[PDB]
Scaffold this active site. Structure first.
Site, PDB file in Angstrom:
ATOM      1  N   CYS A 223       0.880  -1.148   0.000  1.00  0.00           N
ATOM      2  CA  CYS A 223       0.000   0.000   0.000  1.00  0.00           C
ATOM      3  C   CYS A 223       0.926   1.207   0.000  1.00  0.00           C
ATOM      4  O   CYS A 223       1.689   1.419  -0.961  1.00  0.00           O
ATOM      5  CB  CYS A 223      -0.957  -0.036   1.210  1.00  0.00           C
ATOM      6  SG  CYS A 223      -0.223  -0.523   2.848  1.00  0.00           S
ATOM      7  N   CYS A 506     -38.105   3.501 -10.459  1.00  0.00           N
ATOM      8  CA  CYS A 506     -39.368   2.815 -10.698  1.00  0.00           C
ATOM      9  C   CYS A 506     -40.372   3.514  -9.797  1.00  0.00           C
ATOM     10  O   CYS A 506     -40.611   4.705  -9.974  1.00  0.00           O
ATOM     11  CB  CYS A 506     -39.256   1.310 -10.435  1.00  0.00           C
ATOM     12  SG  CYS A 506     -38.270   0.845  -8.952  1.00  0.00           S
TER      13      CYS A 506
END
Length: 568
Positions: A223, A506
Site C-alpha cells: 500500500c 421505478c
C-alpha cells in the site's frame, strides 16, 4: 492461548458482536494485547545509504525476515529493499509485504519481483488520496520502461469501478527469460478510515486468487507503508484459505505471527475490525461466480428443489442476500415509502437552499457500475412534492439520461407522479423544461426535453426512457425487450456523449431499478470477461442502497436475461 483460542466459523458472528459491543471495548483490549514477544533487529533499514529507500523512516524491515536482493558490484547497500516475507495459512513466506515504491526504489522493486520469481503484485492503494501521495508510479504509462536492470512492458490494462488489473512482461538485460506479472490495484479504499462494507474488497480478493498462478514466488503486497491495508489483505486471504480444510479462524494468532515478521501489520483498531467484518461476510456467502459455458447448467441446478429442501436453489440463493438525513422529520414527506431510504454515505446530496433546511435531501443513491463509480443514481419515482428536487438533482449531478421503469399507474394505483411536461413548457423552481419529442416504441417511450437554468440561461438536453412493457404482476416472460432497452439507454450514454450518471427510478427505486442496474453491469461483464456472478452483483448494490432487486422473481429474471443474452 487460552485467552485467544481459534473461533469456529459458526461462532464468528457472536464473537464479532462481543468484540464490537460497548463501542468495540473488547476489540480494543484484544488488539492492544497483541505481542510477538521477541526482540528484532533493523540494522539494514537504518544504514545511511538505506534511509532514503524508506518511504517512512518509522516503518522498517526486520533483518531476520527482510527480502534480500543480490548486490550490485561496487554499490554499498544494493542488497536492500523495505520488504519482509510474511506467512499465510500453512503457507510459509506466502507474501512479500513492502512499501509503495519511491522513484529511487523503482529499480529495486522490480529487481525484487524478478529475483523472487513473483507473478503477482497486489496494490492496496490509489497513487494519490485526498491530495497526498501514497505511492509513486513504478510502472510504465505504456510500452516498455527500464527500471535498473529490468525491462518492464505494459501489455494490457483493465480499468474497472473498484480496481484495475495491469499485465506486464519482464525481461532482464542479457537474459533469455521473459516473465509475466500481473498487478491488481484496489482503488476503492476510502480516503479516511476503512471501507464501510467488505463487498468490494472481497470481489477484488477473488480476482487476485483466480489470476495468481501455481509455480510462482511470493505474492508482492503493498500500500503506502506496506503494513496497514497490506496487513488486512494478507490476514483476510490467509483466513479464507484456513477455512477450506479447517472451518475455524484465528485472526488474533495470525496478526501476532505477522508482527514477528514486519512491524505494525494491521496498523489500526478499525483495520482489525474490518478484517472480522470481511471474514463474517465471506463465510455467509459461497461461490456464485460461473463461466459463460456453465451458466445454463448453473441455472438448471438453481431451478431444482433439492432432496430435503422445500424451495428451489434459486430461492435459497436469493434468501442469502440478508439513515440519518432520510429520517429527519422535515424530510419524511420526501420519501414515497418510510422503509425505503437512502444510506447516508451514498445519498445524492443537493446544494442546500439558504432559507430552507432539509433542501440538501432527496431519496436517491449513487451506485457504481461495471467500469465507473457513481455510474447511476437510483431514486424513487418523484412525488408532486419532490418533483422540483428531482429536476434540480439531475442538473447539479450532470445527469441527462433518466430511466423510468414503471407506468404512471399500475393495478389501478398511482406508481409515479408525472414529473415532466407534455403540452407546453413548465417551470420547476429554478428550471424551465421544454418538451421536444415523444417516441412510442413497442416496449418503451423515449421523451426528449430542453432544460434551462433560469438563473444564468445555461441549457441542457435530457432524454427520458420509460419502459412500458414490464407486466403489472411478476416479471417479463422474455428478457429480449428489456435487454434491448438496456442497450438503447447505454448507446444514448455513448452517442452522446454523457459523462454524468444515468438516473434510474421505478416506484420506490429498488425493485425494477435493481434489475436494470444488475443487468447493465452483468451483461457487460459477460461480454468482456465471459463470467457471471449475479449474487455478488446484487450484494454489492445493497451496500449502496437497501433492497436492490426486491423479489425472488426479479432475481430469477436477472439469470433468465443473462441466459438469453448469451444465446444471442
Amino acid at each position: 492461548m487460552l485467552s485467544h483460542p481459534p473461533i469456529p466459523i459458526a461462532d464468528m458472528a457472536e464473537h464479532t458482536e462481543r468484540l464490537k459491543a460497548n463501542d468495540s471495548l473488547k476489540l480494543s483490549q484484544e488488539y492492544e494485547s497483541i505481542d510477538p514477544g521477541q526482540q528484532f533487529t533493523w540494522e539494514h533499514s537504518n544504514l545511511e545509504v538505506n534511509k532514503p529507500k524508506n518511504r517512512y523512516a518509522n516503518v522498517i524491515a526486520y533483518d531476520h525476515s527482510r527480502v534480500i536482493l543480490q548486490p550490485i558490484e561496487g554499490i554499498m547497500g544494493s542488497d536492500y529493499i523495505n520488504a519482509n516475507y510474511v506467512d499465510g495459512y500453512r503457507r510459509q513466506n506466502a507474501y512479500i509485504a513492502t512499501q509503495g515504491p519511491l522513484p529511487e526504489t523503482f529499480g529495486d522493486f522490480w529487481r525484487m519481483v524478478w529475483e523472487q520469481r513473483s507473478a503477482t503484485i497486489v496494490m492496496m492503494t490509489r497513487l494519490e488520496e485526498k491530495s497526498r501521495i501514497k505511492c509513486d508510479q513504478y510502472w510504465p504509462n505504456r510500452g516498455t520502461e527500464t527500471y535498473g536492470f529490468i525491462q518492464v512492458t505494459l501489455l494490457d490494462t483493465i480499468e474497472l469501478a473498484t480496481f484495475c488489473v495491469r499485465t506486464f512482461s519482464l525481461h532482464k538485460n542479457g537474459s533469455s527469460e521473459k516473465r509475466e506479472v500481473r498487478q491488481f490495484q484496489f482503488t476503492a479504499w476510502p480516503d479516511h478510515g476503512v471501507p464501510e462494507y467488505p463487498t468490494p474488497f472481497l470481489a477484488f480478493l477473488r480476482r487476485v486468487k483466480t489470476c495468481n498462478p501455481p509455480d510462482a514466488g511470493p505474492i508482492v503486497v503493498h500500500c503506502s507503508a506496506g503494513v496497514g491495508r497490506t496487513g488486512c489483505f494478507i490476514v483476510i486471504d490467509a483466513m479464507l484459505e484456513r477455512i477450506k480444510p479447517e472451518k475455524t479462524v484465528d485472526v488474533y494468532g495470525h496478526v501476532t505471527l505477522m508482527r514477528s515478521q514486519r512491524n505494525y501489520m494491521v496498523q489500526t483498531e478499525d483495520q482489525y475490525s474490518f478484517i472480522h467484518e470481511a471474514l463474517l461476510e465471506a463465510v455467509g456467502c459461497g461461490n456464485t461466480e460461473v463461466p459463460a459455458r456453465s451458466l445454463y447448467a448453473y441455472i438448471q441446478k438453481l431451478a431444482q428443489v433439492e432432496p430435503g429442501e422445500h424451495v428451489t436453489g434459486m430461492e435459497l440463493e436469493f434468501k442469502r442476500l440478508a439513515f440519518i438525513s432520510a429520517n429527519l422529520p422535515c424530510n419524511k414527506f420526501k420519501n414515497r415509502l418510510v422503509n425505503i431510504m437512502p444510506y447516508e454515505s451514498t445519498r445524492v446530496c443537493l446544494q442546500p437552499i439558504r432559507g430552507v433546511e432539509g433542501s440538501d435531501y432527496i431519496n436517491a443513491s449513487f451506485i457504481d457500475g461495471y467500469r465507473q463509480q457513481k455510474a447511476y443514481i437510483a431514486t424513487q419515482g418523484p412525488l408532486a412534492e419532490t418533483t422540483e428536487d428531482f429536476w434540480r438533482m439531475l442538473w447539479e449531478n450532470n445527469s441527462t439520461i433518466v430511466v423510468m421503469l414503471t407506468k404512471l399507474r399500475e393495478m389501478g394505483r398511482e406508481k409515479c407522479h408525472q414529473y415532466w411536461p407534455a403540452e407546453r413548457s413548465a417551470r420547476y423552481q429554478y428550471f424551465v423544461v421544454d418538451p421536444m419529442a415523444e417516441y412510442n416504441m413497442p416496449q418503451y417511450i423515449l421523451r426528449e426535453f430542453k432544460v434551462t437554468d433560469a438563473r444564468d440561461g445555461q441549457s441542457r438536453t435530457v432524454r427520458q426512457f420509460q419502459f412500458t412493457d414490464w407486466p403489472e404482476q411478476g416479471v417479463p416472460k422474455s428478457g429480449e425487450g428489456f435487454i434491448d432497452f438496456i442497450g438503447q439507454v447505454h448507446k444514448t450514454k455513448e452517442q452522446f456523449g454523457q459523462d454524468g450518471p444515468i438516473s434510474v427510478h421505478c416506484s420506490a427505486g429498488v425493485g425494477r431499478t435493481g434489475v436494470f442496474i444488475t443487468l447493465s453491469i452483468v451483461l457487460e461483464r459477460m461480454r468482456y470477461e465471459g463470467v457471471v456472478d449475479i449474487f455478488q452483483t446484487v450484494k454489492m448494490l445493497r451496500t449502496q442502497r437497501p433492497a436492490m432487486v426486491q423479489t425472488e422473481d426479479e432475481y430469477q429474471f436477472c439469470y433468465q436475461a443473462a441466459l438469453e443474452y448469451l444465446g444471442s
